[PDB]
């Protein structure tokens, strides 16, 4: 239910759209 | 599409 809005990061948070 | 590594959300 989440879609990345930017590259995912190792051991760190990143931005997602929900749904 | 993934499902709930570390996530903030806009």
């Amino acid at each position: 239910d989440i879609v990345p809005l930017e590259e995912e990061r190792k051991g760190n948070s990143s931005k997602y759209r929900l749904i | 599409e993934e499902r709930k590594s570390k996530y903030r959300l806009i």
Partner: antibody
Amino acid sequence: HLQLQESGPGLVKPSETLSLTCAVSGGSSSDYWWSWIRQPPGKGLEWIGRIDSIGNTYYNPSLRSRVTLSVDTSKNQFSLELTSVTAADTAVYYCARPYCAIGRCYESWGQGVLVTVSS
Amino acid sequence: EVVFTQPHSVSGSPGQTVTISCTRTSGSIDSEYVQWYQQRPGSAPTIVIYRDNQRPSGVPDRFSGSIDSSSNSASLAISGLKSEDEADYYCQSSDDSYNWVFGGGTRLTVLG
């Protein structure tokens, strides 16, 4: 496994601006992000930059001042402009975009377009 | 700047395990994911390993990835070497600004 298709002028004169676009087929053009990479003939991969859905851009520090990336998802257009090209910019330019199935994502690249800088 | 160095050339005869290392010159290897790309003649690079040690479904299970904090390096391991494994391999990771950086590439030759 995305079908990414790069297109551009083939030949660019030295000092002019190299312009490329990329479109995606077989997936959605929304969300995620878009990257450019190049490979001069007979050499290694060199990253150029990335633009993501938040609007943020990232550029190779050694090309920063010459590179502009943009994306229009309604047109299905991922764009690169590289200014003041020289012979060193002759390369295959690849578009890359994550291929995403339920629960899994990893980068998929187009087959590249060769751009030659020559008079 | 941050650099990822690779051996210029790795080779093995069929059946061997070969490894290709990817040494980060500055900052911690563990700080950002490491990807491995394979390139065959006339085609674009394809992921064989991502996020340090994940493998796409169509990539043989003979391929695997690892991270070694003490040498600050990542390794791609190819077990039971086969002729079709012959190719160029590049590692790819990121620096502290989230810029991609590619290693310089390794030619893998399958002997005999």
